[PDB]
Each structure stands twice: as C-alpha cells, then as structure tokens.
Design a protein around this ligand. Sequence first.
Ligand SMILES: CCCCCCCCCCCCCCCCCCCC(=O)OC(CO)CO
Ligand SMILES: CCCCCCCCCCCCCCCCCCCC(=O)OC(CO)CO
Ligand SMILES: [Cl-]
Ligand SMILES: [Cl-]
Lengths: 136, 136
Amino acid sequence: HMASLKDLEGKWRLMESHGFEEYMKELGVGLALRKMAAMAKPDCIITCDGNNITVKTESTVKTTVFSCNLGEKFEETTADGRKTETVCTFQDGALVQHQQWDGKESTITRKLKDGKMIVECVMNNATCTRVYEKVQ
Amino acid sequence: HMASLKDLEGKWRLMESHGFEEYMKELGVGLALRKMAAMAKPDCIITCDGNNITVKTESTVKTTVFSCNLGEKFEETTADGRKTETVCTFQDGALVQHQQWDGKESTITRKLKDGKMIVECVMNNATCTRVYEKVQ
Ligand SMILES: CCCCCCCCCCCCCCCCCCCC(=O)OC(CO)CO
Ligand SMILES: CCCCCCCCCCCCCCCCCCCC(=O)OC(CO)CO
Ligand SMILES: [Cl-]
Ligand SMILES: [Cl-]
C-alpha cells in the first residue's frame, strides 16, 4: 500500500488546486504571472529511470524540465525564473523536492494517494495542495 | 542555410557510426559495455524550450536524460557512468557539449548537415562521427 518512486511515472493532469495563489505570492510571483499560472491547468510528465528522475511541466504558456539523480544537489531554474539549489529525495512514499535560493527555502512533495498524485507545496506559512490524475 | 538550435529538436535515429569503439575506449568504457553500446542503435530525442535544452538518449539497454540551460555549467552523469561538469554552448550552427572530469575533457558537437544530425565526439586523438536521421 505504500508508494514507490516508479508509481509517480506517467502523464498527469491537474484536476484540483487550493492555496496556489497564496503560495505563488510567498515565492514572489507577481499578479500577472499568477493569473497566467492559475489558468494554465498543465500536465506534469514524470519519468523515473532508476534514480534518474525527470519532471516535465507542460503548458501552452511555458514548459519546464529538470532531470536529476535522487539525492544529488543540482541547479534548477524554476518556471517563475528563480535560480535555486535543489535536491530531490524519496521519503515515506513521497518524492520530496527541496529548493533553496537567497537564504529562502521551499519544499514540493509529490505522492500517490488513492491513485491520484497529490502535490503539496510549502513556503513559510503558505501551503498549496494540487491534485493530479493520470491521463489514459 | 546555417542551422539554429531549434533545428536540432526532434526524434532522431542512429543511421551510421564510425570510430565509436575507439572513442569509447578513450573514455574508459570496457569491452562488454562497448559491444552493448555498439549494438544499441538508439534514438536521441532533443527538445529546445528556448535555451532550456533537453537531450534524451533512449535504448533498450539504458535511457539517459540531461536538461540544461545553454552556457550554464551543470553536473552530468553520463551513460557510461562518469560524473562530469558539463557546459552546452551554441557555436556556428552546432550544439557543443563540453565535459570535464578528473582533469580529462571531451567534446560532443551536434549539428544539422543536409537534413541529418551529425554528432561528432572527440577525446584526445580519438574521434567518432555518428549520423542520425529524423523519425517521421
Ligand atoms: C504551474 C506553472 C506552469 C507554468 C506557468 C506559466 C508561466 C510561469 C509562471 C509559473 C508560476 C510559478 C510556478 C512555481 C511553482 C512550481 C510548483 C507547482 C506545483 C505543480 O503542480 O507543478 C507540477 C510540476 O511543476 C507538480 O507536479
Ligand atoms: C550510446 C549509449 C547508449 C546506451 C548504451 C548502453 C549502456 C551504457 C554504455 C554507454 C557507452 C558510452 C556512451 C558515452 C558516449 C555518449 C556520446 C554518444 C553520442 C551519441 O550518438 O549519442 C547521442 C545522445 O547521447 C547524441 O545525439
Ligand atoms: Cl533548469
Ligand atoms: Cl544526470
């Protein structure tokens, strides 16, 4: 019943979002791009080649890809344009993506619950939950 | 008539190879994996989201992906398992991928000639040319 990293592999579509505006505010995202991101309703394509993890976020506005090895720190350029130092780990059934930039930090965790991918984003007191389902 | 980075985008299949064994020897690849790599005849899928470049090498034996921003150094784990510091640049119609590890260096350049992707690999006195064509 506990997920593995491979369970996250696939093409996922955003079905539900809560607290995303508030989270993007904490990250520093301005109004215009916030509204653009809120209307964007993307896919998230995840591939897991062993512990080589690739996460592709695809929308009609912008597409982002990072590809990493689990537990090895890497430089990420985020969709909002932050340059972070990021490490992905796998903890209690969740992919945990920790970003640090300018002495700030945020965590994005992705986990399978009840066949859906639950993506929880935290920065300071701001939390966002996004629900994805698998494209058939 | 001179190529741009976007011309490299697509799904490419290996059609011709010369000097690949000799190049893999210079890299340190042992006999077994050399023969495995020589029979592998992969695809190379390249995406170019502005200057965010993703190169996915796909085979039935192993699949590798790196995703980088042009001109920003990054840590690559190569298909043969080297941990390098790599920088991709765009020079005279070619994507140039420079790898350094342990005071060693190698360059892989990818360019469109006559509608095919020519991939030239150099390390020391060892050179390899691989020819890819676009999958329809
Ligand atoms: C949502 C962004 C799409 C592109 C928006 C258009 C322009 C750029 C503005 C981006 C707004 C800031 C995004 C940074 C937050 C990333 C985490 C999002 C979590 C998520 O569902 O994504 C997925 C994969 O990241 C988790 O599975
Ligand atoms: C060829 C390797 C496929 C996997 C082989 C199976 C197991 C791992 C052994 C790999 C042998 C060493 C490969 C390192 C050399 C990479 C450059 C290859 C150039 C090429 O055509 O690739 C493409 C994309 O890299 C250029 O477009
Ligand atoms: Cl990036
Ligand atoms: Cl890598």
